[PDB]
Design a protein around this motif. Structure first.
Motif, PDB file in Angstrom:
ATOM      1  N   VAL A  50       0.847  -1.186   0.000  1.00 26.39           N
ATOM      2  CA  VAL A  50       0.000   0.000   0.000  1.00 26.39           C
ATOM      3  C   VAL A  50       0.884   1.238   0.000  1.00 26.39           C
ATOM      4  CG1 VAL A  50      -1.745   1.315   1.244  1.00 26.39           C
ATOM      5  CG2 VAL A  50      -1.886  -1.182   1.171  1.00 26.39           C
ATOM      6  N   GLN A  51       0.588   2.166  -0.903  1.00 24.60           N
ATOM      7  CA  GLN A  51       1.232   3.476  -0.944  1.00 24.60           C
ATOM      8  C   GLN A  51       0.153   4.507  -0.632  1.00 24.60           C
ATOM      9  OE1 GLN A  51       5.170   3.508  -3.218  1.00 24.60           O
ATOM     10  NE2 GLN A  51       3.616   3.488  -4.837  1.00 24.60           N
ATOM     11  N   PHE A  52       0.152   5.002   0.602  1.00 26.33           N
ATOM     12  CA  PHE A  52      -0.930   5.819   1.130  1.00 26.33           C
ATOM     13  C   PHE A  52      -0.402   7.207   1.463  1.00 26.33           C
ATOM     14  CE2 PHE A  52      -4.175   7.607   3.548  1.00 26.33           C
ATOM     15  CZ  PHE A  52      -5.250   6.774   3.761  1.00 26.33           C
ATOM     16  N   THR A 114       8.114  15.799  -3.331  1.00 28.01           N
ATOM     17  CA  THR A 114       7.575  14.663  -2.601  1.00 28.01           C
ATOM     18  C   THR A 114       7.581  13.447  -3.513  1.00 28.01           C
ATOM     19  OG1 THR A 114       6.164  16.097  -1.259  1.00 28.01           O
ATOM     20  CG2 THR A 114       5.624  13.749  -1.321  1.00 28.01           C
ATOM     21  N   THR A 115       8.089  12.329  -3.001  1.00 28.96           N
ATOM     22  CA  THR A 115       8.206  11.116  -3.797  1.00 28.96           C
ATOM     23  C   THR A 115       7.963   9.898  -2.922  1.00 28.96           C
ATOM     24  OG1 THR A 115       9.797  12.167  -5.288  1.00 28.96           O
ATOM     25  CG2 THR A 115       9.689   9.761  -5.300  1.00 28.96           C
ATOM     26  N   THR A 116       7.112   8.997  -3.401  1.00 34.82           N
ATOM     27  CA  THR A 116       6.891   7.696  -2.783  1.00 34.82           C
ATOM     28  C   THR A 116       7.268   6.633  -3.803  1.00 34.82           C
ATOM     29  OG1 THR A 116       5.068   8.640  -1.508  1.00 34.82           O
ATOM     30  CG2 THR A 116       5.267   6.248  -1.561  1.00 34.82           C
ATOM     31  N   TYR A 117       8.408   5.980  -3.594  1.00 32.30           N
ATOM     32  CA  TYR A 117       8.973   5.075  -4.583  1.00 32.30           C
ATOM     33  C   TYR A 117       9.020   3.657  -4.037  1.00 32.30           C
ATOM     34  CZ  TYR A 117      11.659   3.825  -8.717  1.00 32.30           C
ATOM     35  OH  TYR A 117      12.066   3.283  -9.913  1.00 32.30           O
ATOM     36  N   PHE A 118       8.635   2.703  -4.879  1.00 31.02           N
ATOM     37  CA  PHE A 118       8.772   1.284  -4.588  1.00 31.02           C
ATOM     38  C   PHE A 118       9.225   0.593  -5.860  1.00 31.02           C
ATOM     39  CE2 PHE A 118       7.620  -2.232  -1.691  1.00 31.02           C
ATOM     40  CZ  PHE A 118       7.812  -3.290  -2.551  1.00 31.02           C
TER      41      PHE A 118
ATOM     42  N   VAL B  50      -2.076  -1.005  -3.863  1.00 34.66           N
ATOM     43  CA  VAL B  50      -2.929   0.175  -3.854  1.00 34.66           C
ATOM     44  C   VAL B  50      -2.053   1.418  -3.851  1.00 34.66           C
ATOM     45  CG1 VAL B  50      -4.677   1.474  -2.596  1.00 34.66           C
ATOM     46  CG2 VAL B  50      -4.803  -1.023  -2.681  1.00 34.66           C
ATOM     47  N   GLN B  51      -2.358   2.350  -4.748  1.00 32.18           N
ATOM     48  CA  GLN B  51      -1.722   3.663  -4.785  1.00 32.18           C
ATOM     49  C   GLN B  51      -2.806   4.686  -4.463  1.00 32.18           C
ATOM     50  OE1 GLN B  51       2.205   3.730  -7.076  1.00 32.18           O
ATOM     51  NE2 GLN B  51       0.645   3.708  -8.688  1.00 32.18           N
ATOM     52  N   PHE B  52      -2.804   5.175  -3.227  1.00 30.19           N
ATOM     53  CA  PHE B  52      -3.889   5.983  -2.691  1.00 30.19           C
ATOM     54  C   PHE B  52      -3.367   7.372  -2.353  1.00 30.19           C
ATOM     55  CE2 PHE B  52      -7.134   7.741  -0.249  1.00 30.19           C
ATOM     56  CZ  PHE B  52      -8.203   6.899  -0.037  1.00 30.19           C
ATOM     57  N   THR B 116       4.114   9.230  -7.240  1.00 26.23           N
ATOM     58  CA  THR B 116       3.905   7.926  -6.628  1.00 26.23           C
ATOM     59  C   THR B 116       4.282   6.870  -7.655  1.00 26.23           C
ATOM     60  OG1 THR B 116       2.081   8.852  -5.341  1.00 26.23           O
ATOM     61  CG2 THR B 116       2.294   6.462  -5.407  1.00 26.23           C
ATOM     62  N   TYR B 117       5.427   6.223  -7.454  1.00 27.12           N
ATOM     63  CA  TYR B 117       5.993   5.326  -8.450  1.00 27.12           C
ATOM     64  C   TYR B 117       6.052   3.905  -7.912  1.00 27.12           C
ATOM     65  CZ  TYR B 117       8.669   4.112 -12.602  1.00 27.12           C
ATOM     66  OH  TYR B 117       9.074   3.578 -13.803  1.00 27.12           O
ATOM     67  N   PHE B 118       5.668   2.953  -8.756  1.00 25.76           N
ATOM     68  CA  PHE B 118       5.815   1.533  -8.473  1.00 25.76           C
ATOM     69  C   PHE B 118       6.267   0.851  -9.751  1.00 25.76           C
ATOM     70  CE2 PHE B 118       4.695  -2.004  -5.589  1.00 25.76           C
ATOM     71  CZ  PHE B 118       4.889  -3.056  -6.456  1.00 25.76           C
ATOM     72  N   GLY B 119       7.296   0.019  -9.641  1.00 29.45           N
ATOM     73  CA  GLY B 119       7.770  -0.736 -10.782  1.00 29.45           C
ATOM     74  C   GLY B 119       9.269  -0.686 -10.968  1.00 29.45           C
ATOM     75  N   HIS B 120       9.701  -0.520 -12.213  1.00 32.48           N
ATOM     76  CA  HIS B 120      11.117  -0.455 -12.537  1.00 32.48           C
ATOM     77  C   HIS B 120      11.341   0.654 -13.543  1.00 32.48           C
ATOM     78  CE1 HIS B 120      15.180  -1.382 -13.745  1.00 32.48           C
ATOM     79  NE2 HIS B 120      14.792  -1.696 -14.967  1.00 32.48           N
TER      80      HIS B 120
END
Ligand SMILES: *[C@@H]1O[C@H](CO)[C@@H](O)[C@H](O)[C@H]1NC(C)=O
Ligand SMILES: *[C@@H]1O[C@H](CO)[C@@H](O)[C@H](O)[C@H]1NC(C)=O
Ligand SMILES: *[C@@H]1O[C@H](CO)[C@@H](O)[C@H](O)[C@H]1NC(C)=O
Ligand SMILES: *[C@@H]1O[C@H](CO)[C@@H](O)[C@H](O)[C@H]1NC(C)=O
Ligand SMILES: *[C@@H]1O[C@H](CO)[C@@H](O)[C@H](O)[C@H]1NC(C)=O
Ligand SMILES: *[C@@H]1O[C@H](CO)[C@@H](O)[C@H](O)[C@H]1NC(C)=O
Ligand SMILES: *[C@@H]1O[C@H](CO)[C@@H](O)[C@H](O)[C@H]1NC(C)=O
Ligand SMILES: *[C@@H]1O[C@H](CO)[C@@H](O)[C@H](O)[C@H]1NC(C)=O
Ligand SMILES: *[C@@H]1O[C@H](CO)[C@@H](O)[C@H](O)[C@H]1NC(C)=O
Ligand SMILES: *[C@@H]1O[C@H](CO)[C@@H](O)[C@H](O)[C@H]1NC(C)=O
Ligand SMILES: *[C@@H]1O[C@H](CO)[C@@H](O)[C@H](O)[C@H]1NC(C)=O
Ligand SMILES: *[C@@H]1O[C@H](CO)[C@@H](O)[C@H](O)[C@H]1NC(C)=O
Lengths: 135, 135, 135
Positions: A50-52, A114-118, B50-52, B116-120
């Motif tokens: 979860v990215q909240f 602001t950055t939310t990275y996965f 989830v990207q919220f 809001t980043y997810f992946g590669h």
């Protein structure tokens, strides 16, 4: 990130190099190669993620406010002159160069506020740089 | 990210190079190669993600406010002159160059305010750079 | 991202190179190659994924406000002159160049204000750069 090389001239797995002015007379080269390679890179196993991000404001006064991005250039001055005078003279300007602000390789990557990275991210550079070859 | 090379001149798996002025007389080259390669890169296994992002405002006063992006250029000045005078003289300007702001390779990638980043994601560069070859 | 090369001149899997002024007399080349390659790149397995963004406003006063994009250029000045005078003289301007703002390779990619990204993205560059060859 695994098998990154910088190889100057020659790259080989099995190399029988022969070069100027040689005799390769009665040789009996023999090979037997098994070069299995198993790669399982970046295999992942996630059940939940979860990215909240939330923002609640209320009954508040927000006066003069500034949020500035990472890099700001202000009042930057480049004031290079070049005054050349000559009265009954000899001038031989050879290979003369004046270099002002200049880049070759520039990579930026989500340099934000602001950055939310996965996940995964990287930056790889390989070159053969040479600025001036003035022979 | 796995098998990235920088190879100057020659790249080979099995190379029988022969070059000027040689004798390759009675050789009996023999090969037997098994070069299996299994790649399972970037295989993923996700059940949920989830990207919220939420924003709630209420009964608040928002006065003079600025949110500025990452890179800002302001009042930047390049003021390079070139004054050349000559009275009964000889001037030999050879290979003369004046370089002002200049790029070659520029890659930007989601350098934002909110991300809001997810992946590669990645950035790879390989060159043979050479600015001036003034022979 | 897997098998990216930069190869200068020659690329081969099996190379029997022969070059000027050689004798290739009684050789008995023999090969036996098995070069299986299994690629399973970027295979994914997702049951659910949600990209959610909400914005609720209410009974709030929003006065003078600015949200500026990532890159802003303002009051930028390039003021390069070139004054050349000559009175009974010899001037030999050879290979003379004046370079002002200039790019070669420019790639931008979703450099935004707000971004919700899921997946894969990358940037790859391979060149042979050479600015000036002034012989
Ligand atoms: C190898 O080649 C040379 C040629 O000069 C010959 O004299 C010799 O008998 C050879 N040997 C074999 C085992 O073939
Ligand atoms: C070559 O490699 C294979 C791989 O198992 C092996 O069976 C064999 O005995 C080796 N030698 C020859 C002469 O084939
Ligand atoms: C984690 O391990 C393997 C994937 O490599 C799979 O068999 C197993 O079910 C995974 N776990 C879950 C909870 O899916
Ligand atoms: C703060 O507010 C005053 C008036 O309330 C204004 O003059 C000033 O410019 C504001 N601050 C900034 C940094 O603008
Ligand atoms: C190899 O070639 C040479 C030619 O000069 C010959 O004299 C020699 O007998 C040869 N050997 C075999 C084993 O064929
Ligand atoms: C060559 O490789 C194969 C692969 O298994 C092997 O069976 C064989 O014995 C090897 N040698 C020859 C001469 O074929
Ligand atoms: C994770 O492992 C494998 C995929 O590589 C699959 O058999 C298994 O069902 C996956 N887990 C879930 C929960 O799907
Ligand atoms: C803040 O508000 C005052 C008047 O309320 C205004 O003069 C000023 O310009 C504002 N701040 C900025 C940075 O504009
Ligand atoms: C290879 O060729 C040469 C030609 O000069 C010859 O003399 C030699 O007998 C040959 N060998 C075989 C095994 O054919
Ligand atoms: C060549 O490779 C095949 C692959 O299995 C193998 O069966 C054979 O024995 C090898 N040698 C020859 C001479 O065919
Ligand atoms: C994950 O693993 C494999 C796909 O590679 C598939 O058999 C399995 O059903 C997948 N999981 C789900 C929940 O679909
Ligand atoms: C803020 O509001 C005042 C008047 O209420 C206005 O003069 C000013 O220009 C506003 N700020 C900006 C940055 O425009």
């Amino acid at each position: 990130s695994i098998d990154v090389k910088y190889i100057g001239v020659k790259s080989a797995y099995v190399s029988y190099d022969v070069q100027k002015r040689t005799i390769y007379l009665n040789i009996t080269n023999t090979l037997n190669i098994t070069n299995n390679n198993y790669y399982s890179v970046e295999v992942e196993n996630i059940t939940a993620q979860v990215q909240f991000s939330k923002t609640v404001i209320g009954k508040a006064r927000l006066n003069n406010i500034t949020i500035i991005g990472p890099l700001d250039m202000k009042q930057i001055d480049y004031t290079v002159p070049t005054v050349i005078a000559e009265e009954m003279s000899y001038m031989y300007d050879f290979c003369t160069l004046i270099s002002i602000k200049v880049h070759n390789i520039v990579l930026m990557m989500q340099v934000t506020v602001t950055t939310t990275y996965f996940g995964h991210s990287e930056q790889i550079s390989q070159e053969r740089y040479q600025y001036v070859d003035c022979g």
